[PDB]
Amino acid sequence: ATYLIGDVHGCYDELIALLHKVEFTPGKDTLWLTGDLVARGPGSLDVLRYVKSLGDSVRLVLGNHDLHLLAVFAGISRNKPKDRLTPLLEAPDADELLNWLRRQPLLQIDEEKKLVMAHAGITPQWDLQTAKECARDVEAVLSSDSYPFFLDAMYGDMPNNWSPELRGLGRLRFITNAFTRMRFCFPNGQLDMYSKESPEEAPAPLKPWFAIPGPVAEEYSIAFGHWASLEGKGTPEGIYALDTGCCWGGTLTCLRWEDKQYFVQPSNR
Ligand SMILES: [Mn+2]
Ligand SMILES: [Mn+2]
C-alpha cells in the first residue's frame, strides 16, 4: 500500500503511532512524506534516523524547515531555541544524517498513480517539464560540495514571478520559494510571500495557489504539506493538503492512496 503523511515537525511518537495504526510494513508498503521532518516537535533526531533507515520504502520531499536546518548545520543561519534542533545538531551521527537529508528531492512524481508531491505544492506558472527541471537544478546545488553557498543565496522574497528567462540567484530563489514557501498567489499566478492565513481570512485579490488552474494540476493529483492554517480543508478535487498541524497541537494525518482513506493521530501535546 501507499501512505502519504504531512509535516512531521519532530513528532516522532505520533509518527510511529500512526504507522502502527496502518501496520506500515517496509517492502510491502511505501511512505511519502511532505517534508518539514524537523523542528518545533521534540524528536527531530529520532525522526531523521528513522526516515533515513527506510531507504527505498520512503519518498521524501524537502521543506522550508529542513532547508533551515541545513543552513544552521552549515553555519549559514542562526539556531532558534524554539526549533529544538540542538539534540540533532549535537548527535554523533549529525553529519551522516544531514548529508543524507540534503540529497533528498524537492519533487516526487509517480506516473502510474498520476501523483505529484512537493512541500508547498506546484505553482500554476509551471508545467510538469519545468517543475522537473527546476527541482533538478536546486537538488544539484544541494547535493554538491558547495551547498552552503546556495543555502546562503536562497533567502529572499523576490523575484515572485516565473519566467524561463530567469537566471542566477533570482532563478534559484524563486524555485526554492515555489517548492517550499508558497501559499497564496495573485490572479496572474505570482507568489505572495507574506500571508500565512487561511483562505477565508486572506485579503483580496489573493487566492490559494491551487485555486488557479495550472497545467500540472489539470493532469496530476498533487499532495503537499506546509500550509498548516489550511487545516487540510478547502481544496479542490485532486489536491491533497496533508499538513494538519501536529506540532501545533492539531493532528498528524496519513492518507492511503489506494482507497483514499484517512488515518489520524492526535497530537500528544
Ligand atoms: Mn513548511
Ligand atoms: Mn511545517
Swiss-Prot record:
Mechanisms controlling activity: Co(2+) is a strong stimulator (100-fold increase in rate of hydrolysis). Mn(2+), Cd(2+), Ni(2+), Mg(2+) and Ca(2+) are weak stimulators; the two latter act synergistically with Co(2+).
Keyword list, A-Z: Hydrolase
GO cellular component terms listed in the entry, alphabetical order: cytoplasm
The keyword Nucleus appears for this protein: no
Cleaved signal peptide residues: none
UniProt cross-references to Gene3D superfamilies, sorted A to Z: 3.60.21.10
A Gene Ontology BP annotation from the UniProt entry: nucleobase-containing small molecule interconversion
Enzyme class of the recorded protein, top EC level: hydrolase
Reaction equations catalysed: P(1),P(4)-bis(5'-adenosyl) tetraphosphate + H2O = 2 ADP + 2 H(+)
GO molecular function: bis(5'-nucleosyl)-tetraphosphatase (symmetrical) activity; bis(5'-nucleosyl)-tetraphosphatase activity; hydrolase activity; phosphatase activity
Pfam families reported for this sequence: Metallophos
EC assignment: 3.6.1.41
Subunit structure, as described in the record: Monomer.
Annotated family: Belongs to the Ap4A hydrolase family.
Function description: Hydrolyzes diadenosine 5',5'''-P1,P4-tetraphosphate to yield ADP.
PANTHER family with a match to the protein in the record: CYTOCHROME C5, PTHR40942
The protein, known as: Bis(5'-nucleosyl)-tetraphosphatase [symmetrical]
